[PDB]
Design an enzyme around this catalytic site. Sequence first.
Site, PDB file in Angstrom:
ATOM      1  N   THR A   1      -3.918   6.367  -2.719  1.00 57.81           N
ATOM      2  CA  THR A   1      -2.836   7.051  -2.020  1.00 57.81           C
ATOM      3  C   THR A   1      -1.650   7.354  -2.928  1.00 57.81           C
ATOM      4  O   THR A   1      -1.161   8.487  -2.949  1.00 57.81           O
ATOM      5  CB  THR A   1      -2.371   6.214  -0.821  1.00 57.81           C
ATOM      6  OG1 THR A   1      -1.921   4.932  -1.277  1.00 57.81           O
ATOM      7  CG2 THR A   1      -3.510   6.024   0.169  1.00 57.81           C
ATOM      8  N   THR A   2      -1.177   6.359  -3.681  1.00 57.89           N
ATOM      9  CA  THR A   2      -0.034   6.580  -4.563  1.00 57.89           C
ATOM     10  C   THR A   2      -0.404   7.480  -5.735  1.00 57.89           C
ATOM     11  O   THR A   2       0.377   8.359  -6.121  1.00 57.89           O
ATOM     12  CB  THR A   2       0.508   5.242  -5.066  1.00 57.89           C
ATOM     13  OG1 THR A   2       0.713   4.358  -3.957  1.00 57.89           O
ATOM     14  CG2 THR A   2       1.827   5.441  -5.799  1.00 57.89           C
TER      15      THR A   2
ATOM     16  N   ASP B   1       0.828  -1.197   0.000  1.00 56.00           N
ATOM     17  CA  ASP B   1       0.000   0.000   0.000  1.00 56.00           C
ATOM     18  C   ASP B   1       0.867   1.254   0.000  1.00 56.00           C
ATOM     19  O   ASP B   1       1.976   1.273   0.541  1.00 56.00           O
ATOM     20  CB  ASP B   1      -0.930   0.007   1.213  1.00 56.00           C
ATOM     21  CG  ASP B   1      -2.099   0.957   1.045  1.00 56.00           C
ATOM     22  OD1 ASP B   1      -2.367   1.376  -0.101  1.00 56.00           O
ATOM     23  OD2 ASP B   1      -2.750   1.286   2.059  1.00 56.00           O
TER      24      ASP B   1
ATOM     25  N   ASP C   1      -8.969  -3.258   1.912  1.00 52.10           N
ATOM     26  CA  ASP C   1      -9.082  -2.439   0.709  1.00 52.10           C
ATOM     27  C   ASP C   1     -10.179  -2.959  -0.212  1.00 52.10           C
ATOM     28  O   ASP C   1     -10.946  -2.173  -0.781  1.00 52.10           O
ATOM     29  CB  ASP C   1      -7.741  -2.395  -0.023  1.00 52.10           C
ATOM     30  CG  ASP C   1      -6.788  -1.375   0.568  1.00 52.10           C
ATOM     31  OD1 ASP C   1      -7.156  -0.725   1.568  1.00 52.10           O
ATOM     32  OD2 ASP C   1      -5.670  -1.224   0.031  1.00 52.10           O
TER      33      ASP C   1
HETATM   34  N1  LIG Z   1      -5.874  -5.532 -14.414  1.00 48.84           N
HETATM   35  C1  LIG Z   1      -5.737  -4.227 -14.752  1.00 48.84           C
HETATM   36  N2  LIG Z   1      -5.947  -3.808 -16.020  1.00 48.84           N
HETATM   37  C2  LIG Z   1      -5.814  -2.515 -16.369  1.00 48.84           C
HETATM   38  N3  LIG Z   1      -5.468  -1.541 -15.507  1.00 48.84           N
HETATM   39  C3  LIG Z   1      -5.228  -1.819 -14.203  1.00 48.84           C
HETATM   40  C4  LIG Z   1      -5.353  -3.211 -13.744  1.00 48.84           C
HETATM   41  N4  LIG Z   1      -5.065  -3.209 -12.430  1.00 48.84           N
HETATM   42  C5  LIG Z   1      -4.780  -1.929 -12.077  1.00 48.84           C
HETATM   43  N5  LIG Z   1      -4.877  -1.101 -13.134  1.00 48.84           N
HETATM   44  C6  LIG Z   1      -4.637   0.364 -13.114  1.00 48.84           C
HETATM   45  O1  LIG Z   1      -3.570   0.681 -12.218  1.00 48.84           O
HETATM   46  C7  LIG Z   1      -3.866   1.889 -11.513  1.00 48.84           C
HETATM   47  C8  LIG Z   1      -3.364   1.807 -10.076  1.00 48.84           C
HETATM   48  O2  LIG Z   1      -4.191   0.917  -9.328  1.00 48.84           O
HETATM   49  P1  LIG Z   1      -3.833   0.530  -7.805  1.00 48.84           P
HETATM   50  O3  LIG Z   1      -2.348   0.724  -7.606  1.00 48.84           O
HETATM   51  O4  LIG Z   1      -4.434  -0.828  -7.533  1.00 48.84           O
HETATM   52  O5  LIG Z   1      -4.635   1.594  -6.895  1.00 48.84           O
HETATM   53  P2  LIG Z   1      -4.487   3.192  -7.050  1.00 48.84           P
HETATM   54  O6  LIG Z   1      -5.319   3.525  -8.265  1.00 48.84           O
HETATM   55  O7  LIG Z   1      -5.043   3.729  -5.753  1.00 48.84           O
HETATM   56  O8  LIG Z   1      -3.005   3.419  -7.228  1.00 48.84           O
HETATM   57  C9  LIG Z   1      -5.372   2.087 -11.579  1.00 48.84           C
HETATM   58  O9  LIG Z   1      -5.676   3.422 -11.993  1.00 48.84           O
HETATM   59  C10 LIG Z   1      -5.872   1.094 -12.610  1.00 48.84           C
HETATM   60  O10 LIG Z   1      -6.510   1.784 -13.688  1.00 48.84           O
END
Ligand SMILES: Nc1ncnc2c1ncn2[C@@H]1O[C@H](COP(=O)(O)OP(=O)(O)O)[C@@H](O)[C@H]1O
Lengths: 198, 529, 529, 149, 527
Positions: free
Chosen positions: E88-89, E55, E389
């Site tokens: 958060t990130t 996270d 989450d």
């Molecule tokens: N399986 C996937 N296919 C396409 N895009 C993804 C997938 N998993 C995550 N993402 C993209 O990665 C980004 C980061 O997601 P995540 O790190 O889980 O949470 P956060 O958006 O809070 O950083 C998201 O904006 C999402 O659109």
Amino acid sequence: PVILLKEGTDSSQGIPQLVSNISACQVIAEAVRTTLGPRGMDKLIVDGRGKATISNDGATILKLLDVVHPAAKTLVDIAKSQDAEVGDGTTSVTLLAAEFLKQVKPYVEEGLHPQIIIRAFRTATQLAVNKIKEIAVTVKKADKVEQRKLLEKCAMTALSSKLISQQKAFFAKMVVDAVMMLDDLLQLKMIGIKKVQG
Amino acid sequence: ALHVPKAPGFAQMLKEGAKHFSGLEEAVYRNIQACKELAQTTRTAYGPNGMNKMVINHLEKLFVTNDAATILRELEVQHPAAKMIVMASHMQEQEVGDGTNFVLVFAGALLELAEELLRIGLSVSEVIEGYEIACRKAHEILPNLVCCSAKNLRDIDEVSSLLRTSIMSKQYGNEVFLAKLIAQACVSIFPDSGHFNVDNIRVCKILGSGISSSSVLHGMVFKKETEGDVTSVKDAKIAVYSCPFDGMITETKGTVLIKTAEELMNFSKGEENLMDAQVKAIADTGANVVVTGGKVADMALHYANKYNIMLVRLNSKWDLRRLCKTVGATALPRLTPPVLEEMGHCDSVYLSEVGDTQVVVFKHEKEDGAISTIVLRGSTDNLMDDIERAVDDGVNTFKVLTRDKRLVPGGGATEIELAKQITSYGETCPGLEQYAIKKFAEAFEAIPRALAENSGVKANEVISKLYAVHQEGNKNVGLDIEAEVPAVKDMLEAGILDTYLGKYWAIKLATNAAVTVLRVDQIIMAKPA
Amino acid sequence: ALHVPKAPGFAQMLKEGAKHFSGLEEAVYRNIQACKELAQTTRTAYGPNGMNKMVINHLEKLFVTNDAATILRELEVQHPAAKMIVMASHMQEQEVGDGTNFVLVFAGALLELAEELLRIGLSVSEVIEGYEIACRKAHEILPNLVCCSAKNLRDIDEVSSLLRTSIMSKQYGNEVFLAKLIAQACVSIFPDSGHFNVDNIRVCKILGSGISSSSVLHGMVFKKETEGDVTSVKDAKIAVYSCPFDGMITETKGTVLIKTAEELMNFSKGEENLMDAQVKAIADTGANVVVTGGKVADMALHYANKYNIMLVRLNSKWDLRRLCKTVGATALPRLTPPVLEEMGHCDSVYLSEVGDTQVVVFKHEKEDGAISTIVLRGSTDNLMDDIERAVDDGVNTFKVLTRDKRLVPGGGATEIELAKQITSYGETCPGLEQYAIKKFAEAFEAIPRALAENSGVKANEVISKLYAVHQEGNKNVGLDIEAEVPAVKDMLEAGILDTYLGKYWAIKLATNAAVTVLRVDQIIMAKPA
Amino acid sequence: LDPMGGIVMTNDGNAILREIQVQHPAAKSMIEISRTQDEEVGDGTTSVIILAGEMLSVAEHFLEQQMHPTVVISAYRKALDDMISTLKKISIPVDISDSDMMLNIINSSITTKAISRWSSLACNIALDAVKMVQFEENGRKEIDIKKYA
Amino acid sequence: KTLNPKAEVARAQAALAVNISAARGLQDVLRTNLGPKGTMKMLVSGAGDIKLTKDGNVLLHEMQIQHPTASLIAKVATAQDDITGDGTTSNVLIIGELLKQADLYISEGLHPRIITEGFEAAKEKALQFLEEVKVSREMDRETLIDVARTSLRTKVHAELADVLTEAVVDSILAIKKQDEPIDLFMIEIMEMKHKSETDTSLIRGLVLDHGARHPDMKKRVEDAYILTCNVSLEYEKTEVNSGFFYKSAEEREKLVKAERKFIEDRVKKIIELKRKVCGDSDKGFVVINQKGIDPFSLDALSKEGIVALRRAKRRNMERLTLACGGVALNSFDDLSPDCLGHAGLVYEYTLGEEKFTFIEKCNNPRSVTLLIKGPNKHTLTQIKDAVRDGLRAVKNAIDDGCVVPGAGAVEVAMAEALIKHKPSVKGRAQLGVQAFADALLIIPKVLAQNSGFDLQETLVKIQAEHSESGQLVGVDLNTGEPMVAAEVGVWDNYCVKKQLLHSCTVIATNILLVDEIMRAGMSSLKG
Ligand SMILES: Nc1ncnc2c1ncn2[C@@H]1O[C@H](COP(=O)(O)OP(=O)(O)O)[C@@H](O)[C@H]1O
Ligand SMILES: Nc1ncnc2c1ncn2[C@@H]1O[C@H](COP(=O)(O)OP(=O)(O)O)[C@@H](O)[C@H]1O
Ligand SMILES: Nc1ncnc2c1ncn2[C@@H]1O[C@H](COP(=O)(O)OP(=O)(O)O)[C@@H](O)[C@H]1O
Ligand SMILES: [Mg+2]
Ligand SMILES: [Mg+2]
Ligand SMILES: [Mg+2]
Ligand SMILES: [Mg+2]
Ligand SMILES: [Mg+2]
């Protein structure tokens, strides 16, 4: 930020600085206050090596004191000047200066212009000089023995408040015969002073 | 708690020990405040009514003077804003010699009146341009206020009346005697066709009686003694020898070689015979006194005393040349008899003493001559130094008057008239330079205000009365001194006259220092060593 | 000299005492080297020929054992990867209790191979996928290698022949007697319908002769003494009382309030009469020995000794529950005499002294019972601790065999067969995971090599001979220990069996630790405290 | 940055001056008068400080002209009286029953802070708070305390 | 400097440069965690505790950085985390990108007010576009499953992610009602250090952290009753100071026997209630007490066959009442049989030293309990954080009546709208709109960089495929080719993105208006 002058410079105003100068000069008068009249005494100064310096004259006392005050050095200068000029009243000038300072201290503290005080001092000094020159009472033609008698009387008067006050009538003729036989230019270096123990 | 870091760019690479002031607040305003604090120190000692100052340096000495140049020299300032003013004062003293406190006050007033302009919004360029325009206008109007010139320069009843104003400002009270002495010394050394030198006046400090016991001497004096027994000499024929009065030898290291006994027995005899022959040949020309400049010998001194030859020994590499120029003689690097054209004719050479100090007086009976020597009498070294400084200032003022015989009304009427003319001219000047012109005109009122503050009267009323008098019609009316009531007095009828070229150079240097300080933007310093 | 600054950002805001490892050279390679250095320490002590290790902790204690769990627990390593390895070993010991050094060697070999796998150019995802595929294949072909099974679990001549292979690995030489004692102790406490408990085995350390004087006991023992004067009772009934053998009082602070000479004289008499009545009612129920767990009194002890009642006092909480479960009785929270259900079912209670240590032995004539105690003898404390650890390991192995009666050949044949099967299966897999599968197959050769190095012979020749034997047609043939020449021997004829579920769990935990370590590429630590 | 360890990010004249440690008595007196002005009316904490600084800066021109401070204080008081008289004479009344005028006044007063984009609701919020705070108890006393909001 | 020599104060340019450097550092540090193809970080505390989490909030809180801007960013991230859920990130990434885009134009010679106005206009345009582009759905079982899978894909691998998704969906469906918002504080998260992590399942009931204390008690009951109460069963003293005064041993024994009569009445009442409810040897009775129980009462309850549990938490009083359906009574006034609960399987489990209590087989439970298993502590913490989450994401998707596709098509559409909207704005706000549009395209750049493909070419291809079409063309993480985002199964949220954009705009407005970091405090160096 950056300072103006050097760090460690002492400063002062005007009225407090003059008051401190007067208070410092009033202490120098107490060192040559007892050595004056015939009944007065002398002082004893010890240096850093362990040598006693006994002298009744105020010039030697002021020279052996080693004063570091910037305002107290004016008395030593006038004392040395008087000793080099005629060599007689070295403490009377200091006493008169101290009395003048003590008299003008309230006039200065009340709020008077220093230029007026300086002008008054100059006028009083000129008037005193004129009066002394008027009542000088000098002679034009005297006898041969009258000059010797006057010299002996002057020597006895000058040697009255000294250590050899008990034998002032014996050294008078000696100094008279010594000065009378000193050619015409009066060479003080030609008189030899020997000191033999016993 | 939380600590803030440094600026990632220039503050990190600034290196410890150094400083940086890029902003206008931590640089220009700081320099202005430093200059104001410096000007507020030597402000009470400006006019004749100002007091003296006792400054002690790090050498454990004593300096109780009154001029601002000596105070600035014996201060050791660690600030460039004040160092610039100190350098300007030193340059003004080297050029003219009577305009340091005035320059400092003018620069301080200009900076104080420009600080408010910079605060309200006037930039540095417009202020500098307005100051330059006002300075040019003042330099153009300055030659229009003369109405006073010097007639003769060799009259004793006229030279002493001009330098009295400059002497009174430095030595209040006893000024007539000093002015007369300076005039006599300048007349006795005045040559022809101009060309007045400043090194032709010698000052001698002798601890004696009071100030009235001092006098002038038409010649030179030396605080030495006589090597021989000859003292009173009537017709003295000075023969100066630059070589030491001894037997000349070889420069290369060389010894004497003797074998038989005849040489060992006759060497000293021949040496003494040659020495006696040389002494007889030297005294055969008619020389009565020999002034050497090196080491003397016993046999030479005995041979000179046998033939009644006075020997004077001195080493200074300057007094010998001064005596040669005074008596009109040339130096000889060898022990050869001089020619008639290389003789030093004098008048009376004797050895006396004044104030328990043996001195050799070379008094000459000629009214003209070459150089002279002023003998000072006193009881304190500070008073003698002040008298010597006043004599030097009077000599510099006489030299300036000889270079330029144009006079301007002193006191404070000239500055008021210049300020009024600048204000009247700046009224018809459009644009944004009118404010700078009016501020430059207001800086001229710092001299009468300082004079009234040193005298002890109201400055505002004095300034108002002076302005009313100048608007009425009178132009040569200054501020009275010998009056406790703040009134006015004429400067032309009294005799308060000062130099014009000196004041012009002072104003020019003050304006230059002001524009140089205003041209400084940021300050970049390092670490002290 | 020029000093290089830091990077304006995370390097400047890293704070003192903290570290940073972003690159793979200062993180993954460092962890791999640390794990290799940690596995190289306990590599010489693996099989039966492995030597012991004298580990001294900070409490000035001696630990001369052979199990790797205690050694890893007594190292105090300040490394994250080593801490994770120690945690995985502790988890494996808690789950099974017979596979720590094997898991350590497997993880070390896997990391050492992954080092070169990442050095040649392969990534981490493909390596992890290949390792997972190889682990799944090894787990799939693992049940297809079972060649033995446990028939009966209550036979003395059968259970002792199964744990002997595990005991010989810890105590080489004297293991048949220990295996027989462990089998007898497990049979005497084995109930019905399975459900074997691990807390029903007691260990008593008594200093005396050697390992030949050891014997098992069908009961419990305590290192206390008899409070009363009763020596030994034949047919006695134990009456356990959790409350202290004394008069009960109120929990709230309260004092007695006597009156005149009547109550002051009758209080003590009534108290003594009540105490005597309680003592008589306690002994009238057929009880002969009273076991308490609190503080006793003098009057109660005297009254119990008057009626011949043995008093046994102990302060261990769990010991009281163990003694209650051994004899079948329960506890009582109040001084209440039993009737017929809360009686005692003992056999012989006597107090003996062996090795200058008086102990109360509760011998039971029944061959079955509840719990038992294995009285161990020895001259040193380290040997006694090692024997206790070996007994605990044998009990854990017996429990594992009771949970799963599937036996697999040990030594060094199962790992070689699994590696050969993985190498034969990995040759038909395309992509980039074939290299990872072949590397995982090569990691299984670290056990036969270590065994051959600990035995005192070569390893390459033994590996080649084992591979040739496996390729010929044999499967249950491993390396030999008693043979001084590098040869092979049948594992089924000698009797080398090991637990299948334990090895499966060990391989699973090793693969989990490998895929967990091979997933972090950057470490962020702080400052120690 | 307070010595506790927090972060003080604001734009008020009193919240910034209260987090500055000084040693000069003049700075302490300025902080005290600023705190009293902030506790009296609530608004106008920087203008008073700026006016005091300007009045003390323009006063040094007369102190260097041998002027006594009593005449300066008398002139200051006479100017303050005239300023108060002028401010009372140029006073313009306003009705309190008009809500639009009060909303416009509040918006013009809060147009300097960071709520210049959300004063469309903060003005009504403050108006409702002022309307709900005003309470009349017994007698002819109408207090408006702020300890209930 | 003149009033406080020991005070550090910075100007405007220095403070701006420091803030920009701090933002760039925080953006470059937290950039390898976006997307499921990111890296795993290892954090070690001062005591020697290993933590393996992914996270952004935990990674930013455990990074050892002392800075005011970093502290503000951490506070904003914690607020976003404990208000919404996941975000958060991306918050820090967008904040840093916006600060860099603002500093790029400020250093050339611009005013921060125009930049702030342009940023506000771009934020309003993006909000309008998001409100006009959101599609309405019914949120069935497949939609929530896909949302949970997309949310948990960036935490663990594939099997554990699907297991956690199924468990979260089942728990949400079990705690689901017909109306009212979804109340939390009902799913108990219990961690056990045994077996592996692949054995994670949902238990329809409640799992306690303590079991029975008396050894002579039943361990497995096929049918028992649930009694929830919190009355005290220990020797309680009176409030006023009292004292006992006897005479002989008989009076003392009588006082001892009589002082333990208050709890005896309650014990007899409970025994009578149990005998009236049950009667024969066919049913059981479980007593759930919140306070301690005296050993005498425990023995009296064990003599009849009652399993009582002492020292329980206050949160278990509502979970048991919602699962079984009993009555949490405090006194024994109206002890009616209808105030009891119904059970199905009450059995305990021993794990070495600790003890557990499993309550399974319920009629209609409303508060389930998620069982978490892990070999290590860091793995358990990571699984718990991932479950939290996922639950937060499911709750946010259920509370809203719309769904937003994930990937990065929304950012591309917002950038295209901002590019098409800047010529319609007057003044110098066009530069601010362009900077805001370029700062919003940082999500696909990080998503394509961590995968192993290009950035500029990928962005150009995405823009070319989106301009010629009219669908939400997302960014793929397998082959790099432009694919559809709202067709495969990638989803996100609307309120979460709105709050993230609002926080980013607020942070940008607060940073672009602060240009003086004065520190004039007390050093506290006395003594
Ligand atoms: N399986 C996937 N296919 C396409 N895009 C993804 C997938 N998993 C995550 N993402 C993209 O990665 C980004 C980061 O997601 P995540 O790190 O889980 O949470 P956060 O958006 O809070 O950083 C998201 O904006 C999402 O659109
Ligand atoms: N008798 C006098 N009456 C009025 N002012 C005088 C008199 N003598 C000198 N001054 C003033 O003193 C000033 C010069 O003083 P001083 O410090 O000695 O020289 P400088 O010109 O170098 O400052 C002149 O500007 C002049 O106005
Ligand atoms: N009698 C034996 N014959 C052959 N191999 C043995 C024998 N005893 C032990 N081994 C081998 O020694 C290895 C070490 O076993 P042990 O020390 O009991 O546990 P661990 O495998 O955890 O070290 C085992 O893998 C086993 O194959
Ligand atoms: Mg005398
Ligand atoms: Mg002068
Ligand atoms: Mg083992
Ligand atoms: Mg305001
Ligand atoms: Mg996420």
